[PDB]
Every structure is written in structure tokens, then in C-alpha cells.
């Protein structure tokens, strides 16, 4: 896999945000994770965590996996990095998303994420409390 540039347009929630990629606005949905919806327990904390991590970054990048790049709602499907740090991983490490939605042929980072989830669980962080 490889990273490509993007810029932030607007935060949305824990696992979606609007980015400009190849100069077009697109809503991205983070691969391999599920944050709670805003109206659910830990939803607001997830949305805050993602918003802060991406808004504070000097460099946002998008990394597609090997399979489909957009979902049935038109959302980009990627791993997002903020100053080289993956958001998807960081959310799971902090117990603010579950590993989820692991579809064959878009699961390159599955084991990396599962490892974070294990540590978040060991620590009883957030969702796992």
C-alpha cells in the first residue's frame, strides 16, 4: 500500500470526515473500525479524538487498501494518517473504536489493529471499561 495526499475540509464524527482528495471533496470512512455514533456512549469522545488528531496534523494522508475504494454510500474507504500516525489504529488503541467491518481483500492492517484492540482491552480503556 502507499500513502497519498489529502487535506481536511470538515470533521464529521469518530470514523468519518470530509477530505479533499485529488482536489475533490469526498467523505471518507475509516477502514476496519467502528466508532460509536455521536448519540451513543463514547460517541462524543470518539468524534473529539478524531477531530483533534486530524485538525492538529500538518500532513493528512490517505492510504487505500487493495480492494474497493468507495462504499455503497459513495464514501472513500481508507486508512488515514495524521503526521504519519494512523487514525484508525489510534482510535482502537484508545478504546474509542472496535475492530469491525473486516471484509476480505480490504484487510491489510487487520492484525495491526487487532493488536491495538487487545492492548486497549487489557487497559479497560473507554468502550472496554
Ligand X SMILES: Cc1cn([C@H]2C[C@H](OP(=O)(O)O)[C@@H](COP(=O)(O)O)O2)c(=O)[nH]c1=O
Which amino acids are annotated as binding site for Ca(2+), given as ranges?
15, 34-35
The number of beta carbons lying within 10 Å of the beta carbon of residue 124 is 10
Q: State yes or no: is 40 an active-site residue.
A: no
Closest contact distance (angstroms) between CB of 125 and ligand X is 20
Give contact residues for ligand X (rule: CB under 6 A): 29, 31, 34, 71-72, 77, 101, 103, 106
Nearer Cβ to Ca ion (3/11):
11
Q: State yes or no: is 29 an active-site residue.
A: yes
CA-based max dimension of the chain: 41
Which residues sit in the known binding site? 15, 34-35
Nearer Cβ to Ca ion (34/110):
34
Selected catalytic residue, list 61, 75, 117, 123 = 75
Q: In the complex, which residues of this chain contact Ca ion (CB under 5 A)?
A: 34
Q: Which residues are catalytic?
A: 29, 37, 75
Amino acid at each position: 500500500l502507499h500513502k497519498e495526499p489529502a487535506t481536511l475540509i470538515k470533521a464529521i464524527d469518530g470514523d468519518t470526515h470530509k477530505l479533499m482528495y485529488k482536489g475533490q471533496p469526498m467523505t471518507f470512512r475509516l477502514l476496519l473500525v467502528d466508532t460509536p455514533e455521536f448519540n451513543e456512549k463514547y460517541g462524543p469522545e470518539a468524534s473529539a479524538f478524531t477531530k483533534k488528531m486530524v485538525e492538529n496534523a500538518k500532513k493528512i494522508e490517505v492510504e487505500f487498501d487493495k480492494g474497493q475504494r468507495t462504499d455503497k454510500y459513495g464514501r472513500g474507504l481508507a486508512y488515514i494518517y495524521a503526521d504519519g500516525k494512523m487514525v484508525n489504529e489510534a482510535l482502537v488503541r484508545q478504546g474509542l473504536a472496535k475492530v469491525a467491518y473486516v471484509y476480505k481483500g480490504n484487510n491489510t492492517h487487520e492484525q495491526l489493529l487487532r493488536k491495538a484492540e487487545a492492548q486497549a482491552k487489557k487497559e479497560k480503556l473507554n468502550i472496554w471499561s
